[PDB]
């Protein structure tokens, strides 16, 4: 299987530089051109540039000639894009892509994207609180985790280390007046199945190196 595996989210200061990696597997690295794409806020797509891994030759969008530098490491089958003199205009998701030739050129495989946030504000890890009802007998039960007061985006949330996926909703983050983010992740279960498991949310915030497990206590018993 072809995979383009990008490096994690990064918070970086205005004026600094950041280097994003694209580790490729499942094909001969030197045989395909790699292209980079920026997606901002508005979800507008821009072509930044591309590199011939075989010889290191590059093509840049002139909008990015003073912003971006593309390189490869042939020995580790990895492309890199370094962005310099960062401003808040550089806050975006960055994709690496492979070009296929079918002179019919298309970007046939895409990395998962890397969210870069350019800010003077310091990182803060989330606090993770249980969402549990005050009490029970409906056809479904809900519980969740409140992932509060973090900066920057993003956080990832799983349930039961990825074993529970059905009926999970992880809300988009909202920016609070404090300038910190918050979201909830919830899961619903048919009432008849509720007792068949424990419910633990797994929260990852890479910019703060925060990893938290929170078991949401079901309260099954009565005296």
């Amino acid at each position: 299987e072809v995979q383009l595996q990008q490096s994690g989210p990064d918070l970086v200061k205005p004026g600094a530089s950041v280097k994003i990696s694209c580790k490729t597997s499942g094909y001969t690295f030197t045989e395909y051109i790699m292209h980079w794409v920026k997606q901002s806020h508005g979800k507008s797509l821009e072509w930044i540039g591309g590199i011939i891994p075989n010889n290191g030759g590059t093509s840049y969008n002139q909008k990015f000639k003073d912003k971006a530098t593309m390189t490869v490491d042939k020995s580790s089958s990895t492309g890199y894009m370094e962005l310099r003199s960062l401003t808040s205009e550089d806050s975006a998701v960055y994709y690496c892509t492979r070009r296929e030739v079918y002179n019919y050129y298309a970007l046939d495989y895409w990395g998962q994207g890397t969210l870069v946030t350019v800010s003077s504000a310091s990182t803060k890890g989330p606090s993770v609180f249980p969402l549990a009802p005050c009490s029970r007998s409906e056809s479904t039960a809900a519980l969740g985790c409140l992932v509060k007061d973090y900066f920057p985006e993003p956080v990832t949330v799983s349930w039961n280390s990825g074993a529970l996926t059905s009926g999970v909703h992880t809300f988009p983050a909202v920016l609070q007046s404090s300038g910190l983010y918050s979201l909830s992740s919830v899961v619903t279960v048919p009432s008849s199945n509720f007792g068949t498991q424990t419910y633990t949310c797994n929260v990852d915030h890479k910019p703060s190196n925060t990893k938290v497990d929170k078991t949401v206590e079901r309260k099954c018993c009565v005296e």
Binding site: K43, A132, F171
Partner: protein, 211 residues
Amino acid sequence: DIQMTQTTSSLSASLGDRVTITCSASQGINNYLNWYQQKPDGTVKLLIYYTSSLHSGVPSRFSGSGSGTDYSLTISNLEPEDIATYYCQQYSNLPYTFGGGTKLEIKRTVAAPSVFIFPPSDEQLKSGTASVVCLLNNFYPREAKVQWKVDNALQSGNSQESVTEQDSKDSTYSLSSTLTLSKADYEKHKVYACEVTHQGLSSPVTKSFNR
């Protein structure tokens, strides 16, 4: 450069309908036009290359058409997994440029939300803030009114809503409303109620707890 224009950036369509997404170039691009699908999780896939060639693994309900400046992506019969933003991209000249995208809003049958209310945890309360959460699960359409009542006093200005992207299997939304109070304000009141109005509900549903 060449500007790619997707004039319609939000497009409504019903399950099983034919859907057409349009793209126009500022000058002729000689069929050097590709279409991409971006799912709500940010993953991007190639659908169509050189105007009309289906990428292997793409369902035959997708086709591409056009020439010169004017190009279309057509979904013959819309499926729930097609919820996404669709982008055109020219490679006639450098720099490669992309349309602004077209996001689908899938129309399905009305479904009321199931409603849940969650109190704040002691773990949060001890640090001086209370978050109370109301969940509206798996509903359509998106329009919903969520009113907080504290001891039967209507609240204003102290809640924030978030909404999921439409589900890839059932085309529903889910919504949270979070009421944020100081610990002191939270402990001043007994009854916390979330009142939900929606097209699928014959009268509003209230979920509440007593502190």
